[PDB]
Design a protein around this ligand. Structure first.
Ligand SMILES: NC(=O)c1ccc[n+]([C@@H]2O[C@H](COP(=O)([O-])OP(=O)(O)OC[C@H]3O[C@@H](n4cnc5c(N)ncnc54)[C@H](OP(=O)(O)O)[C@@H]3O)[C@@H](O)[C@H]2O)c1
Ligand SMILES: O=C(O)COc1cc(F)ccc1C(=S)NCc1ccc(Br)cc1F
Ligand SMILES: [Br-]
Length: 315
């Protein structure tokens, strides 16, 4: 089953292409290849600095009539320096302009934290701490709701919100649109059982980011654990005559999650899509869940004193 129904009534493809770290000179081909081989969901963000090049690919495939716009599911995210009532619409509009779109299928609050507006994506004080904004998640959510009502986006959601932050949104006085999605890091070393059950119980669809452990994250260290090289996962893959990456992508799918592996390698883009023709057993699923070590790979010291930094909590 290729798509999941969201609480806005739209269907979202459970497999999408990630674009963080995709070089601007390789991402246009990556997205063209992805669409040619069946991807219909692309995960984007202004902060990734490559939306223009992603958009060139999307627009060419639309112009070529490889796909119709209604068949694509394009996601982007509001960066932390735009949490301000008077900046949200322009941030969304800049993303739309870059992507060559007249609407997004889904627009996420990228991180719960607002930062001081300006040119810099991570404004710092003289001692290296991020400079916050005083605007809270509830007022930012109201600004997101306006984008739905203006026709710029078909769905809104959140990313990297912890349990209490999701609850804060759900409990917002005068809430108009519930979040459709919470996009969070999830893989066998960070299985997220608590947060996923909370969000799914509320009808919020969870998207798993970094499903391969983000081996190209810029802060990787040689000593860090490696999902793709874990011999226990390789053994499950061998049993199914699949690659380790294919197991790592199928895993979240069978948990009723959406998953967004990144690649700029054409061969891997195609491989990663070939995950609809095999089934992990319940025992395989529980075995993969057993590898949890609460390891994130996506965390940032400079932001840990922000009042809304999400990973102080437990989930
Ligand atoms: N919401 C947020 O805060 C947030 C944070 C992080 C990530 N994300 C989203 O999630 C996406 C995926 O996460 P990620 O980029 O961190 O990492 P990932 O998808 O876990 O891993 C990407 C890495 O895996 C490699 N790879 C891909 N397919 C492979 C295969 N079949 N075999 C071997 N290696 C393979 C890629 O190499 P090549 O590209 O060289 O092929 C790249 O180095 C991001 O791109 C972004 O769209 C969102
Ligand atoms: O964020 C991504 O999608 C992927 O990661 C990034 C992608 C970028 F293009 C630039 C920075 C990041 C970083 S450093 N993200 C971590 C991060 C940012 C903000 C806060 Br609050 C906490 C935190 F942990
Ligand atoms: Br944050």
């Amino acid at each position: 089953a290729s798509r999941i129904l969201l609480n806005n009534g739209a269907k979202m493809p459970i497999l999408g292409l990630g674009t963080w770290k995709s070089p601007p000179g390789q991402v246009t081909e990556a997205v063209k290849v992805a669409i040619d081989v069946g991807y219909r969901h692309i995960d984007c963000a202004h902060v990734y600095q490559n939306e223009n090049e992603v958009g060139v690919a999307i627009q060419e495939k639309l112009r070529e009539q490889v796909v119709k716009r209604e068949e694509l599911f394009i996601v982007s995210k509001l960066w932390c320096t735009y949490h301000e009532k008077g900046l949200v619409k322009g941030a969304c509009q800049k993303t739309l302009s870059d992507l060559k779109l007249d609407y997004l299928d889904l627009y996420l609050i990228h991180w719960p934290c607002g930062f001081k507006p300006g040119k810099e994506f991570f404004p710092l004080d003289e001692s290296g701490n991020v400079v916050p904004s005083d605007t809270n998640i509830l007022d930012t959510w109201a600004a997101m709701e306006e984008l739905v009502d203006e026709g710029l986006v078909k769905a809104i959601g959140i990313s990297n919100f912890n349990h209490l932050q999701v609850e804060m949104i759900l409990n917002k006085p005068g809430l108009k649109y519930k979040p459709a999605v919470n996009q969070i890091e999830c893989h066998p070393y960070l299985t997220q059982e608590k947060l996923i059950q909370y969000c799914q119980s509320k009808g919020i669809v969870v998207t798993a980011y970094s499903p391969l452990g983000s081996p190209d994250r810029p802060w990787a260290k040689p000593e860090d654990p490696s999902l793709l090289e874990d011999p226990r996962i390789k053994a499950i893959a061998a049993k199914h005559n699949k690659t380790t990456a294919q197991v790592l992508i199928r895993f979240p799918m069978q948990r009723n999650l959406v998953v967004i592996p990144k690649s700029v390698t054409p061969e891997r883009i195609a491989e990663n899509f070939k995950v609809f023709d095999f089934e992990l057993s319940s025992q395989d699923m529980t075995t993969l869940l057993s590898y949890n070590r609460n390891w994130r790979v996506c965390a940032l010291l400079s932001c840990t004193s922000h009042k809304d930094y999400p990973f102080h909590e437990e989930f």
